[PDB]
Amino acid sequence: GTVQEIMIPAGKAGLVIGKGGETIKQLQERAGVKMILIQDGSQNTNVDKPLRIIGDPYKVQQACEMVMDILRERDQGGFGDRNEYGSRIGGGIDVPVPRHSVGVVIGRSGEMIKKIQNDAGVRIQFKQDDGTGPEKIAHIMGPPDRCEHAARIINDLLQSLRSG
């Protein structure tokens, strides 16, 4: 398959690997590609690590883009994977929403989720969710600022549902 390599310097470990694998999870799930990078402590433990993104061409394309961004390290957080698309919908943020909340986000016919698109000026894409079970990625398509603006509404809904 298509494999492009990016180099992860020490100090970006919490970004790309997630200090163990936290990020690589989402790089596999959220991006939908298998990223195999030397996390072997016998060779490249402290030294820079080559990220081998394995996947379909357009996937590695979008992933290579995000890898270069979250690895920049603005706050040694790197978002976590990327939180936006990852091969799927290049344009807008990706949104893992809890299974007890996703149906409420929609509504009955979509009263709620249609007003999200009305309020923030966004589009929704239910993409192949990160295969874990609990959360389901509802992608928010649109301009970056409005993307996050939409996730702040959804996240508040989650907290509303947390308030019995």
UniProtKB/Swiss-Prot annotation:
Molecular function per GO: DNA binding; mRNA 3'-UTR AU-rich region binding; mRNA binding; protein folding chaperone; RNA binding
Domain KH: 1-67, 90-154
Tissue: Detected in neural and non-neural cell lines.
Coiled-coil residue spans: none
Subunit structure: Part of a ternary complex containing FUBP2, PTBP1, PTBP2 and HNRPH1. Interacts with PARN. Interacts with PQBP1.
Assigned protein family: Belongs to the KHSRP family.
Protein known as: Far upstream element-binding protein 2
Source organism: Homo sapiens
Gene coding for it: KHSRP
Full-protein interval shown: 233 to 396 of 711
